[PDB]
Design an enzyme around this catalytic site. Structure first.
Site, PDB file in Angstrom:
ATOM      1  N   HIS A 168     129.339  88.143  84.266  1.00 32.05           N
ATOM      2  CA  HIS A 168     128.973  89.066  83.206  1.00 32.05           C
ATOM      3  C   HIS A 168     130.107  90.109  83.145  1.00 32.05           C
ATOM      4  CE1 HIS A 168     125.071  90.672  81.149  1.00 32.05           C
ATOM      5  NE2 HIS A 168     126.117  90.705  80.340  1.00 32.05           N
ATOM      6  N   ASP A 190     120.013  91.377  79.208  1.00 26.69           N
ATOM      7  CA  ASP A 190     120.161  90.871  80.576  1.00 26.69           C
ATOM      8  C   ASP A 190     118.831  91.216  81.269  1.00 26.69           C
ATOM      9  OD1 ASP A 190     120.900  90.656  83.462  1.00 26.69           O
ATOM     10  OD2 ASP A 190     122.970  90.998  82.905  1.00 26.69           O
ATOM     11  N   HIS A 227     119.172  92.391  84.242  1.00 22.80           N
ATOM     12  CA  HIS A 227     119.757  93.501  84.970  1.00 22.80           C
ATOM     13  C   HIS A 227     120.389  94.487  84.012  1.00 22.80           C
ATOM     14  CE1 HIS A 227     119.949  90.004  87.728  1.00 22.80           C
ATOM     15  NE2 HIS A 227     119.423  90.899  88.547  1.00 22.80           N
ATOM     16  N   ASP A 242     123.344  95.653  84.908  1.00 22.89           N
ATOM     17  CA  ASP A 242     124.758  95.407  85.182  1.00 22.89           C
ATOM     18  C   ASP A 242     125.449  96.771  85.002  1.00 22.89           C
ATOM     19  OD1 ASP A 242     124.439  92.674  85.685  1.00 22.89           O
ATOM     20  OD2 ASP A 242     124.835  92.013  83.648  1.00 22.89           O
ATOM     21  N   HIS A 251     130.479  92.192  88.769  1.00 20.59           N
ATOM     22  CA  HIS A 251     129.590  91.741  87.705  1.00 20.59           C
ATOM     23  C   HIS A 251     128.305  92.552  87.578  1.00 20.59           C
ATOM     24  CE1 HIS A 251     126.966  88.990  90.305  1.00 20.59           C
ATOM     25  NE2 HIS A 251     127.988  89.248  91.101  1.00 20.59           N
ATOM     26  N   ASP A 278     122.889  87.606  78.661  1.00 26.18           N
ATOM     27  CA  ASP A 278     122.931  87.179  80.063  1.00 26.18           C
ATOM     28  C   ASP A 278     121.790  86.173  80.195  1.00 26.18           C
ATOM     29  OD1 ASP A 278     122.621  86.972  82.952  1.00 26.18           O
ATOM     30  OD2 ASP A 278     123.689  88.893  83.153  1.00 26.18           O
ATOM     31  N   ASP A 290     120.150  85.154  82.723  1.00 24.84           N
ATOM     32  CA  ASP A 290     119.095  85.590  83.640  1.00 24.84           C
ATOM     33  C   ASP A 290     117.980  86.385  82.937  1.00 24.84           C
ATOM     34  OD1 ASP A 290     119.660  88.470  83.613  1.00 24.84           O
ATOM     35  OD2 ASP A 290     121.312  88.236  85.047  1.00 24.84           O
ATOM     36  N   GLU A 349     126.519  84.050  82.462  1.00 27.59           N
ATOM     37  CA  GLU A 349     125.810  83.735  83.690  1.00 27.59           C
ATOM     38  C   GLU A 349     125.048  82.409  83.627  1.00 27.59           C
ATOM     39  OE1 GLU A 349     126.147  85.591  86.438  1.00 27.59           O
ATOM     40  OE2 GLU A 349     126.600  87.647  85.814  1.00 27.59           O
TER      41      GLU A 349
END
Lengths: 273, 273
Positions: free
Chosen positions: A80, A102, A104, A106, A118, A200, A202, A245
């Protein structure tokens, strides 16, 4: 109506990311959707491993800035971390908004933490972090950003994010207001600016996107994801896309990759009716 | 003690197989096994494709023969066509036996068909096929070839194989005699000669090895495969190995690559006791 695809096989098995997205026929389906698609190929890739990254991320950004005007860019990646290079580069120097999708944020700095870059690109992009990074990649005002799908933060992250003032739409907010509405709010908040969405992998539920670096229970549903991309796409304001990702080494039947190519097509216009 | 690993990302998505194999931690596990290992990297690759294939299988052939005497080569591949190059390169002008473990016999000529070349490597190597290829890859006398695990044959092949006189151990013979006896038998048929083992992941039951180019039901069991490798290992004559047709795009959490890294380790000396 012209679209460029560039790959960043960075992993510093997400480095196989760009290859799975292509095998999922990303390209052919965009032409099927009406766009003319040119494949630029892969950007070569020689705390932990900083310079290599900033270097490859530099090559990336330069490439995006060169690109004729009016060309939509789609960055297929691994880390990422590439976002640093892409968002900056795809901005072409303009004041743009970032819908960071995402699981996250990040958003760390070396102060808040792991040590892996990342987990640090959104922040750097907001201007917070190691200078070897912020100085060549800062490209957006914290106020200009909106996280969506977030369901996992580090304590230093909560702070920086709060201090900074980033609109955060966690999965609690998703469950509560529904994606339809969250979608609308993202557009008001960033009203008037071109939007660069960073997807992302995830962010979708692992139950659906198993091939990813850091799974995190309870994510966006398949339907849910498309609504966001559609609502967003509608604005006609989306200008660039990050598809990241995606780890084949962990995927099944390469489906996590297929899911993105599908969400990409939703974001670039594809509609049921 | 010395071992060289070389990749051939050739798909003319098995071109992703070499990363899959490396990520399955092949190098490392070999080191744990006690070998000093070197990653030579990837051989560049870019009817259908005779010249592009011949060019890469030639870069591969040449690269293997130039290896210092004593270094054991392992070719990580996509297509099974890379074997025309490596079985020739890996032989270094010496007479070697070939233990072909694929669900197919990859023994067609343009005359007998599919059209693809990756179903002709063992034929080319055995001297039958396009002259453009045989002329640089013929490296084995049919009487020195052994096919193990076969369960799919085109008509022309069955005929070509009979004329040729190649020893064929199809799954029917596997079910009748057992791997142990077939292994004693392979070793004896190729007594005295150094051995090169080519491994098509498709020889493992799809149930077990999903991520392979062309699944063909009813294959070896994880224990049979290992047993086989173990017997060929005790012989002390294996000298080179191809690990091919591994497709991560069709696999599951990368268990196909993991399943072969495991078989490589077995062929290279590893044991329970």
């Amino acid at each position: 109506e012209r679209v460029a695809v560039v790959g960043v096989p960075m992993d510093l098995g997400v480095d196989m990311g760009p290859s799975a997205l292509r095998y999922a026929r990303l390209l052919e389906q965009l032409e099927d959707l009406g766009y003319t698609v040119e494949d630029l190929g892969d950007v070569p890739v020689s705390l932990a491993y900083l310079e290599e990254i900033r270097a490859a991320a530099l090559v990336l950004k330069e490439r995006l800035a060169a690109l004729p005007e009016g060309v939509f860019p789609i960055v297929l990646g691994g880390d990422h971390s590439l976002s640093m290079g892409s968002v900056a580069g795809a901005a072409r120097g303009r004041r743009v908004g970032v819908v960071w999708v995402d699981a996250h944020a990040d958003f760390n700095t070396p102060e808040t933490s792991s040590g892996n870059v990342h987990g640090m690109p959104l922040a750097v992009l907001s201007g917070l972090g190691h200078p070897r990074l912020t100085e060549v990649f800062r490209a957006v005002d914290p106020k200009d950003v909106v996280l969506v799908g977030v369901r996992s933060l580090d304590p230093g992250e909560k702070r920086l994010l709060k201090e900074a003032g980033v609109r955060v739409y966690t999965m609690h907010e998703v469950d509560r207001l529904g994606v339809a509405r969250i979608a609308e709010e993202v557009l008001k908040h960033l009203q008037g600016l071109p939007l660069h969405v960073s997807l992302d992998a995830d962010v979708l539920d692992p139950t659906l996107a198993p091939g990813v670096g850091t799974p995190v229970p309870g994510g966006l549903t398949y339907r849910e994801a498309h609504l966001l991309m559609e609502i967003l796409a509608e604005s006609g304001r989306v200008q660039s896309l990050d598809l990241v990702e995606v780890n084949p080494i962990l995927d099944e039947r390469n489906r996590t990759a297929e899911m993105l190519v599908g969400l990409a097509l939703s974001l670039l216009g594809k509609r049921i009716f």
